RNA sequence: UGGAUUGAAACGCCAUGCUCAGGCUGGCGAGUGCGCCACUCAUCA
C-alpha cells in the first residue's frame, strides 16, 4: 500500500509490506498475503488489532478503502 | 502423512588503560618525692 513516514527511525517507509522472497507464504504478489482492501476478495480490517483501530480512528475524522484510512491514521490525524 | 501466514533463517567478524610521579622537611617525657615507727621464742621434764 500507500507509505507510512515521519517516525524516529532510519527511512520512513510504509510498514505490513513485503519486499523479500522469505515472506511468501502460500504463494501471493507482494502485498495480498496481508490482504486489506487490497484485493476485494477479503479484508482483515473490519470486513484488539491495531490497523482495524487505526481505521476506526481514520473515520472518527470524517465525521483500498481500508489501506488508505488506517494509512492516513498512522499519518497523525 | 496435504498445508500450523507454515516450512529454510549466527549478531558475526576484531580492539593496552596506557605512559610516570619522595610523604616529605623538623620536635626533652620532663621538672620532684622517708617504707616509715614498733614487736621476749618464749615457759619446761
Same mark, same amino acid.
Given at each position: 500500500?500507500?507509505?507510512?513516514?515521519?517516525?524516529?527511525?532510519?527511512?520512513?517507509?510504509?510498514?505490513?509490506? @513485503?519486499?523479500?522472497?522469505?515472506?511468501? /507464504? +502460500?504463494?501471493?504478489?507482494?502485498? &495480498?498475503?496481508?490482504?486489506?482492501?487490497?484485493?476485494? =476478495?477479503?479484508?482483515?480490517?473490519? +470486513?484488539?488489532? @491495531?490497523?482495524? /483501530? @487505526?481505521?476506526?480512528? &481514520?473515520?472518527? =475524522?470524517?465525521?483500498?478503502?481500508?489501506? +488508505?484510512?488506517?494509512?492516513?491514521?498512522?499519518?497523525?490525524?
Amino acid at each position: 500500500w500507500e507509505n507510512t513516514s515521519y517516525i524516529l527511525g532510519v527511512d520512513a517507509k510504509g510498514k505490513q509490506e @513485503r519486499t523479500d522472497k522469505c515472506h511468501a /507464504a +502460500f504463494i501471493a504478489h507482494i502485498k &495480498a498475503y496481508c490482504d486489506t482492501a487490497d484485493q476485494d =476478495l477479503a479484508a482483515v480490517l473490519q +470486513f484488539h488489532e @491495531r490497523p482495524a /483501530a @487505526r481505521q476506526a480512528w &481514520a473515520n472518527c =475524522l470524517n465525521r483500498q478503502e481500508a489501506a +488508505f484510512s488506517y494509512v492516513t491514521a498512522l499519518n497523525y490525524l
